[PDB]
Design a protein around this ligand. Structure first.
Ligand SMILES: *Cc1cc2c(cc1C)nc1c(=O)[nH]c(=O)nc-1n2C[C@H](O)[C@H](O)[C@H](O)COP(=O)(O)OP(=O)(O)OC[C@H]1O[C@@H](n2cnc3c(N)ncnc32)[C@H](O)[C@@H]1O
Ligand SMILES: *Cc1cc2c(cc1C)nc1c(=O)[nH]c(=O)nc-1n2C[C@H](O)[C@H](O)[C@H](O)COP(=O)(O)OP(=O)(O)OC[C@H]1O[C@@H](n2cnc3c(N)ncnc32)[C@H](O)[C@@H]1O
Lengths: 576, 576, 52, 104
């Protein structure tokens, strides 16, 4: 440890990694701190699902994800356990047990909200969907010139797309994917258009996909190194960053207070530039622990000195979920171009097709795969090959259907634990609603209760806003029922449902961007700079100030890119 | 990738790491292959629990374990799903889905048996309990001289405990440890002896324990390297080892066929010496895949050419489990030495004790921690400090109580604790029985069904033998019920039960050790060398041929140390 | 089933289960109010919950 | 085979059945409320020892049926409630409501 750097970044998620990639690239002397540790393998902050073993038993990855999702606010438990033996110690009240938060109203929570403390953050487990927002979902970066605003967003997203290696091709030879894609495409007759979900991934072989992650944006190795002899970067894992120190006029940050979790020691790290990328919840915790916003249960009577919008206007998407079992009609269509004779399991059985025939419903590569599966595996009653990659279908958000869709299979902290229905038949349905930012929806911090790292305990006061948010969420549920039925019936055990609020982990707005602090009720400008402070920047979904349905990380990356432009324009890196 | 080494080890679990530490240290050019990958952090093959965030969120580690336990043999599923939509594809038979094994009788399974494929193997997640076996549990290493046999086993165990860093004091200043330790010592005074579980672990601070793993045995760094400039070792993860190539005469291994899972390429690796440490299941798979024992369903009309006892006489332990809620009486005694004035919350609440007082029931270190807790947390109704380390108590196997016991808390694939009862109150009880080896209990491999790595699918034909094994298992359940009652009543939701067969993961006997192949119905001699073959050795629980109740790894490590002593004497390292 | 059909619980405390997966359009409680014949006098931790 | 073991409970003043003066039942009569815990002391010790006896005795006949593991039943489900209007010789001395002819 140096005590002095050009830039310090808190958190080694994919958004901290954007700031590192831009600024280490540009010659700045950079340090990054993470409260979490390198576990992930020799590629630091890489995607934990890039093992052969995981992609051969993908269902087990759900557990890995649950293992690193730590709930943000758990209300005090009031379950009645009245069958303890009379000799066992028995409680008289629902007292504060097992890390629970007595500030939390159980009926106004984001009970599903959780955080991950490891190097690379949530990008070590995420499902890698990186779509662009359309205008209706996107903050403005220029007003009163939509063409200029469009050109800015296109440049930034394009760059963000390179950093993540976003693509729409990785699943193009999957039979399940094309079976679902083509059917929805036919059914909607141009009313909606379908495509592959844009994924941050590169395919390495037919049975393996290198999913992207932080490591993809920046490899997190210390520099200088032989591969980058003129760059300067140090990562410090197991370091809780607790507060930034403000000067007296509140126009500059003077240091970052840290706590080394292994030695126990504390330090004050000095930098020219301080970047907070600790996630939407923890950025806000760190600012409020620093004297920004208001500590404790909200109280209009003593309105804060600084950032009165911090932790208000928060948004989290509604999420509806089901699983379907492929229709007979679609399964039989897999084999539409085949001539099948005799009885499976006899030497006289055969399966053929005519290559190139203009009337075939499917291409040759598909019929080849089907033929070989059905000829080599005559004991199997399905025409889909055993290792056919998953579907990855979306029709993106549009004003007349204002929700994102994913019609796919991926690993999440829920999603079928079942064995009785063949996995080749099962398609997941996830529709994501947009939520209006409302002042009364808040993330705040207890002035009494603390979390496991002795910081102010986060507390939500959240409900989906009535009016348009709620009308679309229900219309969205209906849309998913109507759409999914074109492909098949619901899988028993995964019937259509709203999921636990915040499970979807797309919280935004906690330290929101806009042009004017007051008129826009916001915390950072379009450079991601905290209002008032020359040298403090926030990055993450917490910046997004709009109601969005699409998955937000790519948009948050784009914002961080723009932020790094302003930093190059106003700070000089130290000589090497 | 040299094509030639002095020694090749298949398997990077603790036992393979024993051969490595011994043979790399003695100057052999050693290569090690593992089908799985470095994930675990920069300490290769280290315990995954050793993170600050896991040890602050220890209930989450259960998910990590679940995520890397892949079931060995899952029988064909016969659950009825009769609530599909009539449009959905629906089965006509219970056909083979999702990885199930049609050879498996579901009533003669070890359905809880599971394998872990990652660098370090199961040692990246185990709960670190390493006791010694008494004579009753233990194979003989010296014939006709009980005292020389004990001398040899003491020398081996001593070395193996040093490699694991085994100890019996890391939990000595736990209040809950001592609370239970003391009560049971007193209840069984003159009848049974209680102590701490011998644990491969080193305490680093009052709230942090460095659990041991394969990494403790050997750090798995490629050599030569700065701190060992003269040693030669290379680790190759993501390599499936598939066959050892027998010479026509069956007197020697000529090479190791491997499949690099990243490139897809297959290779023959050459060594002087071949060591299989792939675990009890997968060592056996590999051998049967190489022509040893008999491929397919057992058919005694066909004695196999080699190792007719391979995959017979398998043993797995009966495992009984419950959890308890500490008695009111015990919880009160925790604060027995305390002088209390007024009540909590009120102005003059004070809690004090007199160190050294002869009327004190507890030591000063206990009282100090209780006093401080009760004074610093007057809202909490219990006297146990929040970060009190876990309890870790055992009464070891004896003739009059022939089962191992563990009266503790730790993370397993089951037994995750709920949220309504305070965790400070909860104690886990696991009692492990011993299983008589019997020729009819078998692990065998399909001649046609293959697993996810296209190797012969493992199938169990297993039942707990009638007689002593069965009577003892039931007596063991009653003992748990009687012993647990001294400490507290059963926790609702963790009532006393037998756990699913094999969930215990202490599988033994699959490639069992003895003096004479024929007379003792075994596969390896006491040097762990395969009968007939000059240069093939097996390591692991599968070598153990007795009925044992205590946890096996430490015993397996001892036999490997003995195995290395043979190898050192009989093969010469190549020149550096 | 017949027995269950004629055993009517004597005292049911106020329900404090959290149902947070209702549709946003559905009417949602702000409190754990007296619902369905529950008894608000009853301390759920000092009951004979099974008396009928 | 079903195993049911039934323990005795010491009569204590503080264990009560009472009636709300506001809340009413389905028949518009005052809502019954309990305030009960198994008494500390002999009741509780006996109850636990009783669970142990069942685990010990039952084992002579057979193992537990999975899904019917030994447990304490939700309080009152046994339906053997007593002493709500208790008998004794003398109302004050024996803390009671009826004499031994069951007259109030
Ligand atoms: C869990 C997950 C998330 C996810 C997803 C599926 C799952 C199961 N699917 C996604 C998808 O397909 N696409 C989408 O856009 N996003 C999806 N997500 C969400 C995504 O992972 C997050 O939006 C993204 O990772 C946010 O990145 P950011 O870099 O802002 O935040 P992070 O990854 O959470 O990293 C923050 C880190 O900072 C640390 N930290 C926290 N507090 C401190 C303090 N006080 N001091 C120092 N470091 C701190 C963390 O430990 C962490 O690494
Ligand atoms: C899971 C578990 C284990 C466990 C424990 C609690 C949990 C939840 N508690 C333990 C305890 O407290 N004390 C005890 O003695 N045992 C405990 N266990 C079991 C213990 O972990 C194992 O007994 C021990 O790890 C076994 O050692 P070993 O070195 O023999 O084997 P392994 O750890 O299973 O690793 C073998 C490896 O080899 C690989 N592999 C397998 N097949 C191949 C092929 N074909 N080619 C190349 N490599 C192969 C693996 O990937 C693996 O890492």
């Amino acid at each position: 440890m140096d005590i002095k750097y050009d830039v310090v970044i808190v958190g080694s998620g994919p958004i901290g990694c954007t700031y590192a990639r831009e600024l280490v690239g540009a010659g700045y002397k950079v340090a990054m701190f993470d409260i979490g540790e390198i576990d992930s393998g020799l590629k630091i902050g890489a995607h934990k699902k890039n093992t052969v073993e995981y992609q051969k038993n993908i269902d087990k990855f759900v557990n890995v994800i649950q293992g690193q999702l730590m709930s943000v606010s758990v209300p005090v438990n009031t379950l009645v356990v009245d069958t303890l033996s009379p000799t066992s110690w028995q409680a008289s009240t629902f007292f504060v047990r097992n890390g629970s938060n007595p500030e939390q109203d159980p009926l106004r929570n984001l009970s599903g909200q959780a955080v991950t403390r490891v190097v690379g953050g949530m990008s070590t487990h995420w499902s890698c969907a990186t779509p662009r927002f359309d205008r209706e979902q996107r903050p403005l970066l220029v007003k009163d010139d939509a063409d200029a605003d469009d050109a800015e967003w296109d440049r930034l997203y394009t760059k963000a797309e390179s950093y993540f290696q976003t693509g729409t091709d990785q699943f193009k030879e999957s039979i399940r994917h094309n079976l679902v894609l083509n059917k929805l495409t036919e059914e909607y007759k141009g009313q909606r258009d379908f495509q592959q979900i844009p994924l941050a991934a590169t395919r390495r072989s037919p049975t393996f996909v290198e999913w992207s992650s932080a490591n993809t944006v920046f490899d997190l190795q210390n520099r200088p190194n032989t591969d980058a002899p003129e760059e300067r970067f140090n990562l410090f894992p197991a370091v809780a960053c607790e507060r930034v120190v403000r000067n007296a006029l509140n126009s500059e940050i003077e240091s970052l207070h840290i706590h080394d979790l292994i030695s126990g020691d504390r330090f004050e790290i000095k930098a020219d530039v301080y970047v907070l990328t600790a996630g939407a919840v923890h950025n806000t915790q760190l600012l409020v622990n620093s004297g920004f916003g208001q500590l404790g249960r909200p109280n209009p009577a003593n309105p804060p000195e600084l950032l009165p919008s911090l932790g208000s206007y928060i948004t989290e998407q509604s999420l509806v979920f089901c699983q379907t079992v492929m229709s007979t009609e679609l399964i039989d269509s897999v084999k539409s171009d085949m001539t099948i004779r005799g009885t499976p399991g006899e030497l006289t059985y055969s399966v053929t097709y005519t290559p190139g025939a203009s009337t075939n419903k499917h291409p040759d590569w598909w019929n080849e795969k089907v033929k070989n599966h059905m000829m080599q595996h005559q004991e199997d009653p399905l025409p889909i090959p055993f290792e056919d990659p998953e579907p990855q279908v979306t029709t993106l958000f549009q004003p007349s259907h204002p929700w994102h869709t994913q019609i796919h299979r991926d690993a999440f902290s829920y999603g079928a634990v079942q064995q009785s229905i063949d996995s080749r038949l099962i398609v997941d349905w996830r529709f994501f609603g947009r939520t209006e930012p409302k002042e009364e929806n808040k993330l705040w911090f207890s002035d009494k209760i603390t979390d496991a790292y002795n910081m102010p305990q986060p507390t939500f006061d959240f409900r989906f806003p009535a009016g348009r948010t709620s009308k679309e969420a229900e219309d969205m549920m209906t849309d998913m029922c109507v759409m999914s039925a074109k492909i098949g019936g619901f899988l028993p055990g995964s019937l259509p449902q709203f999921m636990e609020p915040g499970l979807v982990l797309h919280l935004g707005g906690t330290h929101r961007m806009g042009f004017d602090e007051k008129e826009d009720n916001c915390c950072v400008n379009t450079d991601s700079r905290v209002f008032g402070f020359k040298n403090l920047f926030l990055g993450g979904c917490g910046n997004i100030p709009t109601a969005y349905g699409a998955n937000p990380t790519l948009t948050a990356m784009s914002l961080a890119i723009k932020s790094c432009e302003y930093i190059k324009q106003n700070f000089t890196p130290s000589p090497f």
